[PDB]
Design a protein around this ligand. Structure first.
Ligand SMILES: O=C(O)CNC(=O)C(=O)O
Ligand SMILES: [Mg+2]
Ligand code: NI
Ligand SMILES: [Zn+2]
Length: 331
């Protein structure tokens, strides 16, 4: 079995290997990359996402989210308070202000220490989940707006034609902005490209050990667990590496820098934080190997998780027994 310790793997495809996206994902899995839940892909030196980032300041962040924490430094939840709209230029200036800017630090490990010590005492503002793309239309390789759609994959594997679309999303971050522990909708893959700015640190639990993280989360967030049998779908809970180590949960960590791709694999729980002002683009995708994970994915039916239009068909076709209850949660 390849990669039996479930380490995060890093890949350096050549320009020739960067042509065929599906083929390269299947290659990475042949080497055991999925066992970690996360892989890094460094694009060939010839590739670029677009020519420059000099003209992005007028993108609108219609609903910036202030991420307010509750709990203790290593075990907390966050809620998202909606803020007034602002442009990317306005948000960049905010991120760089004395109130929100990255503190002085020695290296990524010192910054990670400071994040876990101090996150809860601040409420950073995240421009998350903005439909759109920063890939130039002429970028033909690993252009996250030109991937094969999940609906087309389901149709190719299973023969059923379904409604829905699959488009990318932009994330504008600042110091301390945080992504809570989660797997993707329907335990899909994700791919995330860091277009510009400061790094993003990731934590990940191997898919084969995801239920260990779930059981710890039920212990640590007991009221949330009683409220919903899949409350990590709410994407609000944080658990620090120190707490994970104290409770024996297998995990790994890695820092993504500008110009790098990360792939999350089906049922790979992940969480992380931004080091400073940055912009990422991410989208979900599927492969043949995903189908079985989609069929087994948990679902939130309490009403909190509320998701996209296109998840309907995935539930309806892959999980018909759960469909009625899940749809009630959506309505
Ligand atoms: O970058 C972020 O805030 C969160 N991204 C992801 O969870 C992802 O790409 O799957
Ligand atoms: Mg602009
Ligand atoms: Ni994710
Ligand atoms: Zn729920």
């Amino acid at each position: 079995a390849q990669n039996p310790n479930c380490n995060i793997m890093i890949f350096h495809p050549t320009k020739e290997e960067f042509n065929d996206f599906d083929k390269y994902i299947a290659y990475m899995e042949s080497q055991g990359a999925h066992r970690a839940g996360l892989a890094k892909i460094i694009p060939p030196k010839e590739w670029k996402a677009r020519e420059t980032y000099d003209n992005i300041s007028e993108i609108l962040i219609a609903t910036p989210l202030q991420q307010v924490a509750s709990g203790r430094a290593g075990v907390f939840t966050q809620y998202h308070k909606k803020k007034k709209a602002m442009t990317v230029g306005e948000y960049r200036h905010l991120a760089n202000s004395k109130k929100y800017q990255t503190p002085p630090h020695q290296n990524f490990e010192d910054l990670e220490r400071k994040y876990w010590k101090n996150r809860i005492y601040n409420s950073p503002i995240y421009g998350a989940d903005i439909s759109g793309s920063l890939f130039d239309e002429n970028t033909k390789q690993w252009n996250l707006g030109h991937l094969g759609t999940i609906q087309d994959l389901l149709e190719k594997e299973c023969g059923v034609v379904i409604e829905g679309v699959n488009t990318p999303y932009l994330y504008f971050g600042m110091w301390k902005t945080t992504f809570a522990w989660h797997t993707e909708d329907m335990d899909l893959y994700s791919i995330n490209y860091l277009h510009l700015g400061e790094p993003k640190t990731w934590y990940v639990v191997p898919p084969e050990h995801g239920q260990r993280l779930e059981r710890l989360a039920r212990e640590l967030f007991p009221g949330s667990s009683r409220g919903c049998g899949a409350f990590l779908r709410h994407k609000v809970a944080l658990i620090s590496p120190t707490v994970l180590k104290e409770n024996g949960i297998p995990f790994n960590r890695i820092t993504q820098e500008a110009g790098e791709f990360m792939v999350t694999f089906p049922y790979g729980y992940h969480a992380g934080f931004n080091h400073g002002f940055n912009c990422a683009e991410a989208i979900n995708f599927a492969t043949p190997r995903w189908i079985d994970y989609g069929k087994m994915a948990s679902q939130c039916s309490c009403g909190e998780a509320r998701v996209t239009f296109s998840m309907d068909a995935f539930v309806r076709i892959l999980q018909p027994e759960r469909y009625d209850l899940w749809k009630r949660g959506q309505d």
